[PDB]
Enzyme design. Structure first.
Site, PDB file in Angstrom:
ATOM      1  N   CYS A  38      -2.382 -32.080 -56.094  1.00 54.88           N
ATOM      2  CA  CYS A  38      -3.740 -32.250 -56.613  1.00 54.88           C
ATOM      3  C   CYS A  38      -4.421 -30.895 -56.782  1.00 54.88           C
ATOM      4  CB  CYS A  38      -4.593 -33.134 -55.695  1.00 54.88           C
ATOM      5  SG  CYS A  38      -6.309 -33.437 -56.289  1.00 54.88           S
TER       6      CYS A  38
ATOM      7  N   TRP B 188     -12.232 -37.583 -61.317  1.00 52.41           N
ATOM      8  CA  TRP B 188     -12.458 -37.485 -62.747  1.00 52.41           C
ATOM      9  C   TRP B 188     -11.316 -36.684 -63.372  1.00 52.41           C
ATOM     10  CZ3 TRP B 188     -16.238 -35.393 -59.363  1.00 52.41           C
ATOM     11  CH2 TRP B 188     -16.146 -34.000 -59.187  1.00 52.41           C
TER      12      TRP B 188
HETATM   13  C1  HEM Z   1     -12.483 -35.009 -58.422  1.00 52.66           C
HETATM   14  C2  HEM Z   1     -11.692 -34.732 -59.465  1.00 52.66           C
HETATM   15  C3  HEM Z   1     -10.147 -34.657 -59.359  1.00 52.66           C
HETATM   16  C4  HEM Z   1      -9.399 -33.900 -60.168  1.00 52.66           C
HETATM   17  C5  HEM Z   1      -9.987 -32.983 -61.268  1.00 52.66           C
HETATM   18  C6  HEM Z   1      -7.995 -34.070 -59.808  1.00 52.66           C
HETATM   19  C7  HEM Z   1      -6.880 -33.463 -60.382  1.00 52.66           C
HETATM   20  C8  HEM Z   1      -5.565 -33.882 -60.263  1.00 52.66           C
HETATM   21  C9  HEM Z   1      -4.464 -33.698 -61.201  1.00 52.66           C
HETATM   22  C10 HEM Z   1      -4.552 -32.950 -62.554  1.00 52.66           C
HETATM   23  C11 HEM Z   1      -3.374 -34.281 -60.682  1.00 52.66           C
HETATM   24  C12 HEM Z   1      -1.964 -34.362 -61.308  1.00 52.66           C
HETATM   25  C13 HEM Z   1      -1.850 -35.771 -61.860  1.00 52.66           C
HETATM   26  C14 HEM Z   1      -0.664 -35.991 -62.760  1.00 52.66           C
HETATM   27  O1  HEM Z   1      -0.182 -35.035 -63.425  1.00 52.66           O
HETATM   28  O2  HEM Z   1      -0.222 -37.165 -62.834  1.00 52.66           O
HETATM   29  C15 HEM Z   1      -3.744 -34.876 -59.415  1.00 52.66           C
HETATM   30  C16 HEM Z   1      -2.918 -35.558 -58.561  1.00 52.66           C
HETATM   31  C17 HEM Z   1      -3.289 -36.151 -57.362  1.00 52.66           C
HETATM   32  N1  HEM Z   1      -4.583 -36.281 -56.877  1.00 52.66           N
HETATM   33 FE1  HEM Z   1      -6.257 -35.343 -57.633  1.00 52.66          FE
HETATM   34  N2  HEM Z   1      -7.964 -34.975 -58.758  1.00 52.66           N
HETATM   35  C18 HEM Z   1      -9.259 -35.377 -58.464  1.00 52.66           C
HETATM   36  C19 HEM Z   1      -9.611 -36.288 -57.486  1.00 52.66           C
HETATM   37  C20 HEM Z   1      -8.784 -36.807 -56.516  1.00 52.66           C
HETATM   38  C21 HEM Z   1      -9.185 -37.671 -55.412  1.00 52.66           C
HETATM   39  C22 HEM Z   1     -10.639 -38.136 -55.224  1.00 52.66           C
HETATM   40  C23 HEM Z   1      -8.072 -37.956 -54.693  1.00 52.66           C
HETATM   41  C24 HEM Z   1      -7.902 -38.783 -53.406  1.00 52.66           C
HETATM   42  C25 HEM Z   1      -8.950 -39.058 -52.607  1.00 52.66           C
HETATM   43  C26 HEM Z   1      -6.951 -37.250 -55.305  1.00 52.66           C
HETATM   44  C27 HEM Z   1      -5.633 -37.247 -54.876  1.00 52.66           C
HETATM   45  C28 HEM Z   1      -4.536 -36.920 -55.657  1.00 52.66           C
HETATM   46  C29 HEM Z   1      -3.149 -37.195 -55.368  1.00 52.66           C
HETATM   47  C30 HEM Z   1      -2.627 -37.902 -54.106  1.00 52.66           C
HETATM   48  C31 HEM Z   1      -2.406 -36.736 -56.373  1.00 52.66           C
HETATM   49  C32 HEM Z   1      -0.871 -36.833 -56.479  1.00 52.66           C
HETATM   50  C33 HEM Z   1      -0.553 -37.835 -57.594  1.00 52.66           C
HETATM   51  C34 HEM Z   1       0.940 -37.965 -57.685  1.00 52.66           C
HETATM   52  O3  HEM Z   1       1.643 -37.337 -56.855  1.00 52.66           O
HETATM   53  O4  HEM Z   1       1.457 -38.679 -58.575  1.00 52.66           O
HETATM   54  N3  HEM Z   1      -7.429 -36.583 -56.405  1.00 52.66           N
HETATM   55  N4  HEM Z   1      -5.073 -34.602 -59.194  1.00 52.66           N
HETATM   56  C1  M5L Z   2      -7.498 -39.240 -58.602  1.00 52.49           C
HETATM   57  C2  M5L Z   2      -6.915 -38.635 -59.864  1.00 52.49           C
HETATM   58  C3  M5L Z   2      -7.654 -37.697 -60.590  1.00 52.49           C
HETATM   59  C4  M5L Z   2      -7.097 -37.141 -61.752  1.00 52.49           C
HETATM   60  N1  M5L Z   2      -7.775 -36.244 -62.516  1.00 52.49           N
HETATM   61  N2  M5L Z   2      -5.870 -37.531 -62.155  1.00 52.49           N
HETATM   62  C5  M5L Z   2      -5.117 -38.429 -61.473  1.00 52.49           C
HETATM   63  C6  M5L Z   2      -3.751 -38.785 -62.047  1.00 52.49           C
HETATM   64  C7  M5L Z   2      -2.712 -39.240 -61.031  1.00 52.49           C
HETATM   65  C8  M5L Z   2      -1.468 -39.799 -61.727  1.00 52.49           C
HETATM   66  N3  M5L Z   2      -0.350 -39.971 -60.778  1.00 52.49           N
HETATM   67  C9  M5L Z   2       0.884 -40.238 -61.553  1.00 52.49           C
HETATM   68  C10 M5L Z   2       2.076 -40.689 -60.696  1.00 52.49           C
HETATM   69  C11 M5L Z   2       1.729 -41.893 -59.809  1.00 52.49           C
HETATM   70  F1  M5L Z   2       1.499 -42.967 -60.559  1.00 52.49           F
HETATM   71  F2  M5L Z   2       2.743 -42.152 -58.988  1.00 52.49           F
HETATM   72  C12 M5L Z   2       0.469 -41.579 -58.997  1.00 52.49           C
HETATM   73  C13 M5L Z   2      -0.686 -41.107 -59.891  1.00 52.49           C
HETATM   74  C14 M5L Z   2      -5.637 -39.001 -60.305  1.00 52.49           C
END
Ligand code: HEM
Ligand code: M5L
Ligand code: HEM
Ligand code: M5L
Ligand code: H4B
Ligand code: H4B
Ligand code: CL
Ligand code: CL
Ligand code: GD
Ligand code: GD
Ligand code: GD
Ligand code: ZN
Lengths: 401, 401
Positions: free
Chosen positions: A105, A277
């Protein structure tokens, strides 16, 4: 302790936090698998003991009377019941730490600003739906998005799990086609077929919002249509290319992940959806330009009159930049929160600096933090990172079907 | 125990069985991944046996007379002298294998076409200079570039080593000022100060080709001015932005790496300069736009009249793409070999498929194969990769001071 260098400034730090990494990752000294997307009361007690010590450290009461009492209390509850229950403030702190600890993240500068909705008393799929609608309503907030998580009841012995079958709360259908293609979002073919199988009357658009499949313990999933006015969307237009509106493209305002498991102190919350967002590259580069997603890149380049017969014209790069411009412009016009990849990576660098001070390091997955366009134009490209697993954590889990 | 590897654009799965051979264990542990870090007596017989075995399997001549004979001679040489000399064809085959094994090289589809100049009978910095000069003019070939490596004598105990003090055979000067900041290339301010320190009259310009510092064993180095007609350079102009030529930008034709240690069969060649041709992002994105390199990004954006007042105009992305266009266009108009990152990454995917059949895998460093712009627009972005060390190899080594 790993030595970490920033190559743009020259600065050097050591990731001491990494030595506390509990669970193990997929790499060995033989081979690195960093680029892979998806790599007993006694162990419950030691997990719980470590989270409790974390919590009492954060409120500046390490080793206090209240600290020992809670340890003693948890061991007694695990002895009598095989599990234990989190206090409300422990749950709030545990949800924020899970976000803080999430290596993939880039948004984590925000980790302390998180609205925690305690739905652990939730009783059915129908009540689960109401909690989810209120989550979407609060988080969307008419376009001024607020970060939030709703926490449904923990996994416990004797009963099945609450599960949200949808990978996100807002998703567009993907319809397999007459000629084998996909109409809509190809990422969502599987859940779309499940919705139809479970009574949903499909549409045939490219941006049809899916219903929710909600699973209460030891129940089949139940279908719930989202109220149209709760799902805020943004038609995509370009500030100078006027034909861009004629593509009919849209995206939704709220990214709300609903298929991950929240783990706090050994307790597991298989249903705990969370939202923040968007960063504009998720929509403009990945969701719209991935060859296996909406795959609009060549159609945009043809319209822009670019020479699409040679790669050296850089037509792909030029078309993708304008798609990202259109996303940012459209969300700004609609007054829906959005961050561009330069502002987001710049704020992530401040997070690393805050975290080096606060904790002696920060878990980060370089390949996920660096944006999918213009990587080396962002400061995170030039920053070495150490990737590891800390708890509390968001974990992946298998799909319930 | 055989890593499963998925490609996410197509859905295909392979297994990297080749990873089961990895020798020089890398930096990662189950506890933490360090994949993003740039730089993370008779044992000689072990690596010699293994390399000779490699050589004969590759010519389909394992377990047959000529194989056993070569095994005994290396034994006899190391028993008598403590080291051994490589047969000509073995040196040729090892140089190509070291290229083929380089996980950070996107251009390995070319690994089978490599010209090896055997400079092992060399003595003194004057002989190196004529060897290096023969390499450069052969590799440059009036702009029809041809990959080549020159192998200077191997390392032996007690006596110093051959070393080229420059990281590349063609590098630009970097001069400090009345204020620390640098005119020319900041990547070379160190070796520029050594060249000036060792007797060279510095220029004033922003693109002055540095002299060579060549070092024969146990002797101080010697400066060598490179023949101006042998350093092929390309002035940079843009196909349609007529003012781009006025920025006075240039880059040289030949990427020739002269600071890496070639290691074959337990033998170490600290002077073994290799060269090929540039991928255009290397010049236009890293060398010209990195904040700690020429850092030209904003100057181009001002000329394009872009709005540098908000990052969400994506002015950095736009200027970066146009800089890259100018590199490709300039090299094409000068008839100098260059490859764009789309063409290169597409050939690497082909290389992965070839190597899956030939060897059951391919060591690849995802963070270095994915290009520094438009990463997710190239196929390698969507390909999971496994990183590990096979021998023979190119290895990093300390500066000779
Ligand atoms: C507030 C604005 C936020 C921004 C701008 C942001 C940004 C991002 C981005 C760009 C990714 C990569 C997603 C992808 O490529 O699929 C990501 C992944 C992730 N975010 Fe954030 N996020 C935000 C809020 C949050 C919040 C509120 C949570 C949890 C309370 C969170 C938890 C995670 C987690 C666990 C991942 C891993 C997703 C995965 O492994 O597939 N994010 N985030
Ligand atoms: C909270 C949040 C903010 C953001 N800006 N973007 C995301 C995208 C997460 C997408 N990620 C893809 C693989 C999955 F499905 F396993 C888990 C979610 C999440
Ligand atoms: C012929 C066309 C070639 C192309 C297009 C190419 C491309 C590249 C690129 C883009 C990199 C990344 C380096 C960086 O970002 O600094 C790289 C690295 C590397 N290449 Fe190639 N290369 C070519 C030829 C060769 C040859 C001929 C050899 C050896 C005989 C070689 C061996 C290596 C090695 C060892 C690295 C690692 C460099 C480092 O770690 O700094 N390459 N290559
Ligand atoms: C052979 C080759 C081809 C190519 N197209 N590009 C390169 C760039 C390598 C740059 N690399 C920088 C770090 C170092 F100095 F340590 C070694 C050289 C090399
Ligand atoms: C195979 C490769 O690891 C995969 O395509 C990754 C690369 N980095 C990523 N980074 C982000 N933020 N999101 C992603 O989906 C991916 N995908
Ligand atoms: C810190 C980070 O690993 C570093 O900037 C790397 C990333 N990927 C790279 N990839 C290539 N090809 N060349 C590089 O110099 C780098 N730098
Ligand atoms: Cl998304
Ligand atoms: Cl270079
Ligand atoms: Gd227009
Ligand atoms: Gd159309
Ligand atoms: Gd002007
Ligand atoms: Zn690793």
């Amino acid at each position: 302790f790993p030595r970490v260098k920033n190559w743009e400034v020259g600065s050097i730090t050591y990731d001491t936090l990494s030595a506390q990494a509990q669970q193990d990752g997929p790499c060995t000294p033989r081979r690195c698998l960093g680029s892979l997307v998806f790599p007993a009361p006694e162990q419950l007690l030691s997990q719980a003991r470590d989270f409790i010590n974390q919590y009492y450290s954060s409120i500046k009461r390490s080793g206090s009377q209240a600290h020992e009492q809670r340890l003693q209390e948890v061991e007694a509850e695990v002895a009598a019941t095989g599990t234990y229950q989190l206090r409300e403030s422990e749950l709030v702190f545990g949800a924020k730490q899970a976000w803080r600890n999430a290596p993939r993240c880039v948004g984590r500068i925000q980790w302390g600003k998180l609205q925690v909705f305690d739905a652990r008393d939730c009783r059915s799929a129908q009540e689960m739906f109401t909690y989810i609608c209120n989550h979407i309503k609060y988080a969307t907030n008419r376009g001024n998005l607020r970060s939030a998580i709703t926490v449904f009841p923990q996994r416990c012995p004797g009963r099945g799990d609450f599960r949200i079958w949808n990978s996100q709360l807002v998703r567009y259908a993907g319809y397999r086609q007459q000629d084998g293609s996909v109409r809509g979002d190809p990422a969502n073919v599987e859940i779309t077929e499940l919705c139809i199988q479970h009574g949903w009357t499909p549409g045939n658009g490219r941006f049809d919002v899916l219903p929710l499949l909600l699973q209460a313990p030891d129940e089949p999933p139940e279908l719930f249509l989202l109220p149209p006015e709760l799902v805020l969307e943004v038609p995509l237009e370009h500030p100078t290319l006027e034909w861009f509106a004629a593509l009919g493209l849209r995206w939704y305002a709220l990214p709300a992940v609903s298929n991950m498991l929240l783990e706090i102190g050994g307790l597991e919350f298989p249903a705990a959806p969370f939202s923040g967002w968007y960063m504009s590259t998720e929509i403009g580069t990945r969701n719209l330009c991935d060859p296996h997603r909406y795959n609009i890149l060549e159609d945009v380049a043809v319209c822009m009159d670019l020479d699409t017969r040679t790669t050296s014209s850089l037509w792909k790069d030029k078309a993708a930049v304008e798609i990202n411009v259109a996303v940012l412009h459209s969300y700004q016009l609609a007054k829906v929160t959005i961050v561009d990849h330069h502002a987001a990576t710049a704020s992530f660098m401040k997070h690393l600096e805050n975290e080096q001070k606060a904790r002696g390091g920060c878990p980060a997955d370089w390949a996920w933090i660096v944006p999918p366009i213009s990587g080396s134009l962002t400061p995170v490209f030039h920053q070495e990172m150490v990737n590891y697993f800390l708890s509390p954590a968001f974990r992946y889990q298998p799909d319930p079907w």
